[PDB]
Subunit: 253 residues, 4 copies
Amino acid sequence: RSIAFSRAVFAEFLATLLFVFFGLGSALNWPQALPSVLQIAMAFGLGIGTLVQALGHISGAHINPAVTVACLVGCHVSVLRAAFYVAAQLLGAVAGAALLHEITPADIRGDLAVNALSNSTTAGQAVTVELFLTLQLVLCIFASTDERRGENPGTPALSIGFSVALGHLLGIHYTGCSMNPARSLAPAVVTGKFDDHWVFWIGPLVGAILGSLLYNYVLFPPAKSLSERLAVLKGLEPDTDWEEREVRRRQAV
Amino acid sequence: RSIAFSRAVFAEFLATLLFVFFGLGSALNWPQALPSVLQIAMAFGLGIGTLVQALGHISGAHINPAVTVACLVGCHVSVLRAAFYVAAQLLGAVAGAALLHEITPADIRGDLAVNALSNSTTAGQAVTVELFLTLQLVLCIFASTDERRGENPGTPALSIGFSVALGHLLGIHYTGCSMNPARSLAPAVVTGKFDDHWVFWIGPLVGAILGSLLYNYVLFPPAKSLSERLAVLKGLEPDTDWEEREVRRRQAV
Amino acid sequence: RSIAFSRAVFAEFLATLLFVFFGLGSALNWPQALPSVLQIAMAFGLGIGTLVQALGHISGAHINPAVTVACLVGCHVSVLRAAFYVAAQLLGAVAGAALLHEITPADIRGDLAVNALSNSTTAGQAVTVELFLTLQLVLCIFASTDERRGENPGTPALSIGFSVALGHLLGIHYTGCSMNPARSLAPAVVTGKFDDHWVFWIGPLVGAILGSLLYNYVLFPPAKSLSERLAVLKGLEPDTDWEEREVRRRQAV
Amino acid sequence: RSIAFSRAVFAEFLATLLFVFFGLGSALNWPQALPSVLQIAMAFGLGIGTLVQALGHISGAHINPAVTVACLVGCHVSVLRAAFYVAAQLLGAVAGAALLHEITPADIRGDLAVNALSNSTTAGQAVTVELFLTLQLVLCIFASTDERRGENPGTPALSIGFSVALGHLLGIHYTGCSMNPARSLAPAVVTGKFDDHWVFWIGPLVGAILGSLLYNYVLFPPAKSLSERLAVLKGLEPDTDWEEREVRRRQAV
């Protein structure tokens, strides 16, 4: 402790401020012109894609606590680097979310794009949808940040962005799409609406972990943890058969 | 038999579950907000693009039996690996398709995006459209998975995704766009609607094979099958002319 | 004469069939659902992007006579390879355009997306717009096919596609956007509507050439034509100054 | 002075002509069909992405004085090369903007997409939004033009384009989105509407500089300016401790 990391820690702060600012803002109920699911999907997806590009080298652009946690369960980040990230992400989030409230005229800042269950979907259903929404993202982020595969280097930024977008295309009708506890918290804070908030903390965290676990373990990534104690296996591994050869011979004598 | 393949087999299962879940879901008749052709095009196209990215290394992301079959006619996959894929794809498909029925409120899960002929288009026409819809995809997938060309490495995921999207942009008005027997089966199963189902099994399979055949044979890919018996040609190849030289000389004597 | 070229010649045929089929089809006046400028923009742009990807290695994916001509004025293609391309492009075009008429129910195949002046725009204006629409494309195609720059290898397919898209986003309101004499001819043929057809042959050809000329000459590409006769310059180049040195000395004596 | 630079200077002229021509044009109030926020977002974003691709090698495709200035504050361009750029950008801008007025029928060229405060947003708010709109772009442009990172070479053109797009998705509702003093000036000129024009010169310039400063200094880019006088530090750096060792010893004697 500590060096460039502090700045990297910062980078996330700038990222989640920006993403939430643009994101929520682009999803408001503008009376003269009203946001379509796609546009709102594009806006976030592009927002992330843009950030993962900008700050990808500096931070890994988690830009999302669930992603961070996914990165943690998968042992891609420190335990310290995780906490500082989430902290910044939550703070960076409510920062932009406030800047937006200030920047927007009173008539149309209504909801502020808080995450909220729609079409009579149960918090039980809703949370299920959020689970998958994030996992799919986590699966993308990992395949594209995966060092093992640099031959298909492109395209972590754009692919992720559009993954996020894909999340929205479905997850809006159920929830308006959190995928990102930071994202869903900031507006809930400023606006005071915490209805079924937990949904946007469990669905993501759960899908994100599952995601992390499947890529890190269910599929990939072959390597040796070295703590597997492969020195014990090699003692019996040849010797047990030598023993069978050696012990069966001495039974012969 | 058998190793990582089993997992790869799995990967497809996860892929077709996800793609169909997001896909159908994003194409439902949401009363408050209704899906435009583009959005529904983007949603699938992005879904595939995202998957080919995520699971591309693990599976080849066929995510489609017609693609798999295309890959088979083109000798890009095993005969065993094909069957297991299709199996998983069909099962992975109806899996997400069910998860969606459960997750969606009763009022708006109506059709469930089953594939169904629209605008008084004949199953004869419809099937013709599906033919081309898939071929074009198959042509893309191959050009982008083509090993011979790594200099233009990018961009198999995004290009494929958007290819899929391109498929939808037209194939929706005729059929709502199958390109993918798995995709069109899952909803037909759960919903019981099997009207003109065959269309979504023949159009794709046919276009996919054609596609596979043109890239594998009509154009490319120069290599030697070695079973061409090029050892017989080389016996006559020089010697026939030596024979003409040698036999015309001995006619001179 | 002749080898793989014949097939490459073919590749264009398959490309322009496909692009026009999907393209026109996706831009028809569907009564139940009607195409927005974007969707129609995306549909073509994606169509090209997809093709340049699929057949890029085989053909260069001109997919457009104006592009071909641009490639000709820029000396990127043979004079023979050009003609065969254009021929195939025109034939490939009217081929898909027919397939579409056959595949589409009578009620909604109306216009068939023929190119036609809109919003009381003069053929004089219209043609001007088409000029720029294509040049911009030609400028993109060249920068992305430019061998001199392989460090930024990506992304010829996607960038071109979206360039095409960009063309449509503006060129639809003026003309429905030709950029491609093949594209605008096929529907004019089948439908019999040749109103102001020339516009879609001059605007493109003109913008395409201009485009070709600026990249090939106004900017780039440094190389030696060797016919510049740089052997004459090198005789005077040093010797004229030696002569000044040598002749001024002998004037001194 | 001077060589290819003159042409490069030109390249910007061609770029800002094109971008503004397509851009404004695609954002006009077309009566029969009216531009959605996305489409207008796509149109510019694609326009830039296309240009950064086409002319990226020749110019750096600033295509924007604020970007240029950002590039200046960050010492990425000459002081001379900056001025000529801005000059050309402003002139290239009003050039296309005029070409558009001439090309468009009188009924629908109304606003001409001038930048203008909307939804009762204060020039104070408005300018704040513009600040962030550009910074985010500047952050992207730099991360993607950053030489230090060629391993993730892609994708400067597309990522930038879509960054621009992201700018529009939000910045339209507040201002119709300038991000680009050139862009906002051209229409204000031709149309005579200079209402709150300053907003579109301060917001961008301010966000662009901030952006430039954070990437150039707050984060990155490790290098040595050599004017840091690291020769003074190295005199005391070892010697001060040798002095402590040497001076404490002589105090011992």
